[PDB]
Symmetry: D3
Amino acid sequence: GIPRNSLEKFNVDLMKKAGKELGLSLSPNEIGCTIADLIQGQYPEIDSKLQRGDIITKFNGDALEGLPFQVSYALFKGANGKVSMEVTRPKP
Amino acid sequence: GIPRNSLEKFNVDLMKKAGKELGLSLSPNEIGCTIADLIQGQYPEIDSKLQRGDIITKFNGDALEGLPFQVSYALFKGANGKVSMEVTRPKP
Amino acid sequence: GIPRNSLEKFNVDLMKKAGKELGLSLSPNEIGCTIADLIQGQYPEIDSKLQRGDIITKFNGDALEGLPFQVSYALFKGANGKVSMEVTRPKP
Amino acid sequence: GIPRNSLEKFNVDLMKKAGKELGLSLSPNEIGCTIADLIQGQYPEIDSKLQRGDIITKFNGDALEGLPFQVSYALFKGANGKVSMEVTRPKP
Amino acid sequence: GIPRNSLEKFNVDLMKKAGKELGLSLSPNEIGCTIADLIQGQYPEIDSKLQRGDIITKFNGDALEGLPFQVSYALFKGANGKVSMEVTRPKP
Amino acid sequence: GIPRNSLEKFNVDLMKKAGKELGLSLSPNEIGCTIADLIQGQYPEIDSKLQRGDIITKFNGDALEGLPFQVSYALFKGANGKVSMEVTRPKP
């Protein structure tokens, strides 16, 4: 199936100061976790970089492609301290 | 891939009184059907328990994980009488 | 898993006059690409036929079922001239 | 991904008998169940029409594409008498 | 899709030794890794309990269902000593 | 899921000849096509470099990861001359 490309990525790094739900509502797919909701974030990173529909493809170094949601969800839930995410905006 | 957990679930039971689209717009994924739209439901259950982005993981006893959407869609379409759903809210 | 059906489809044909993002924000799944966003389209077709949550199942003749998003995304990105899409509205 | 073929299918029909296993070890995949191994001498129809590597795509009327192995396996295990399968030999 | 069985699991335990490969060729699938081929004579436990076509579903405590093969394979490759597997024999 | 390896790849190159089948029975999976079975004696390069269980991951320049088998199979079937494959031997 010849045509195949990138999916340009951008980073979103934040500090997980306990007492905060990242605010991200997620949806699992083959390439990562789709953002369903983003209640006006609490990280300049999320607020000025993320939007509904964006797909988080890597979390703290772990590629999310192909991972069962039970695994990816656990990764997000265990976020403590410096959180770093790679994201792609699927708008051809 | 060590970290792996639950996905806490909650139930939504309603009475399928003919003449009503459940109002649920769906999206298929590996763990179930994602709710795309929920036009102000017509079941105290849906209205006070469901939101866009929630994932229905079981319908009338049939687990939706891994099912082709052609199958899950048919299950919803054939809903008649007591409808019972297990749902998870993917917000780490 | 006995129950299995159709997914009625409808078409959306437009003219790709350069200088326009189709405006479609996409989400990959097993049957096609889910529309995440549809900024008030620029094609009578998209504006009067598409809505958030709809799933594009075929693009210019290529069925999108089972295709890696890296492939489908590339197909949309390379759209030039007469664009034809088959879509399904997942509302049981 | 342009090239996409419809696969050739042949039929295998037999009558299961108590105490006589089908003798097929199955491996699930997106289009059906691959015969990972088979014991010759169980049923004449299997010996005459099936070979290691063949992929069973329909079992007693139910299409196996996309089904979780827990469902496909249940279908095979639940057949006490008539067995009708559609199969493809994946040897390009 | 109503019929859906919980698969029978058996345990295989061994102590890996330097210079002695497990001798198993693996094929990934949704529930685990199918033993596509195996060389007899490597480990007594494999010779006594495993056969071509068996599907390894858990490896040293990690469930293999849904894992990308790049992860499952890494788990197998990383075992230098104790190996504990859960396995199912898919022969309906 | 932390552990995730990049798999070792080797090349297989041959010139297909009319009347001489490749002799490979393929089984689709997420990373490519497993050689479920193969008939020795067809091509010297296959006899010298391939074995049952090997997984073909690229065919004549097209990566096979994630492709529907209907597409991968079409690629193999469409090769009338030069055949260049990338392959991995999944034996941890």
